C-alpha cells in the first residue's frame with residue numbers, strides 16, 4: 001500500500017540549471033541515471049512554498065501513464081525537491097515555433113492523439129491542467145508526447161479571460177483546440193495582432209477567434225471540424241477528451 005515516494009537523503013545531485021518552475025529552479029540531475037530536479041533554492045521554506053510543493057507532489061504522485069511526464073519521487077532534505085524522468089528532445093513549441101520542424105501530417109495527427117490520450121487520463125483522475133499549451137507538450141526522442149507543467153493568453157478560453165473558478169475540463173479542451181491549430185497551421189494564433197490587451201479583450205468578448213482558413217491543404221476535414229468544436233466560445237458546447245480521442249482515432253485510420 002506504500003509507494004515509497006520519498007527519496008532517501010543524500011542521494012540526489014544536481015548539475016546544469018535548465019530553467020525555473022512553480023516554487024523553484026529546474027536542473028538536469030542524477031538519481032539512478034539522468035533526472036530533472038525541481039528544487040527550492042532556500043533551506044528554510046515559507047508556508048506558501050511548502051504548500052505549493054505539497055500540492056504539486058500530490059497531483060504528480062497520482063499519475064502513471066506514458067503520455068504524462070514520469071514523477072519519480074520527492075525530497076525535503078536538505079531542500080524541497082521534485083524528481084522526474086529526464087527526456088532527450090524538445091517541447092512541441094520549440095519544434096513548431098523556434099526551430100520550425102516540418103512534421104508529416106501522420107506525425108501531426110499522432111502528436112494530437114497522444115496529447116488527447118494524456119489529457120483524457122488526467123481528466124479521468126479529475127486533474128485539470130490549467131495551462132495546456134505546446135510548451136507543456138514535450139516530444140521525448142521527438143516522438144512520444146509527455147505532458148507536464150514545465151513553467152499563455154493564446155491558449156486561454158474566453159471564460160478564463162473574463163474571470164471565481166473559470167477552470168474546467170472544457171477550458172483544457174479549448175487550450176487543446178489551440179494546440180490543434182498550432183499543429184495544423186505551424187503557427188501561433190493572432191500573429192497579425194501586435195497588441196496583447198486587444199487580443200485579451202477581443203477573445204474574452206468573442207470578437208476574435210482563431211483563423212481556421214489558415215489550416216494546411218492536407219489537414220483532414222474531420223480534424224478541422226474537431227478543432228472548431230474544441231474552440232467553441234461557449235464552454236458547454238465543447239466536446240470532452242473521450243469524444244476528442246475517439247474522433248482523432250477515427251480520422252487517423254483514413
Ligand SMILES: Cc1ccc(C(=O)Nc2cccc(C(C)(C)C)c2)cc1-c1cc(N2CCOCC2)ncn1
Nearest residue numbers: 026036037038082084085086087129147148149150
Ligand atoms: C522537474 C519537474 C518537476 C515537476 C514538473 C511538472 O510537470 N509538474 C506539474 C505541476 C502541476 C501539474 C502537473 C500535471 C502534468 C499533472 C498536469 C505537473 C516538471 C518538471 C520539469 C521537468 C523537465 N524535464 C526536462 C526534459 O526532460 C523531461 C523533464 N523540465 C522542466 N520541468
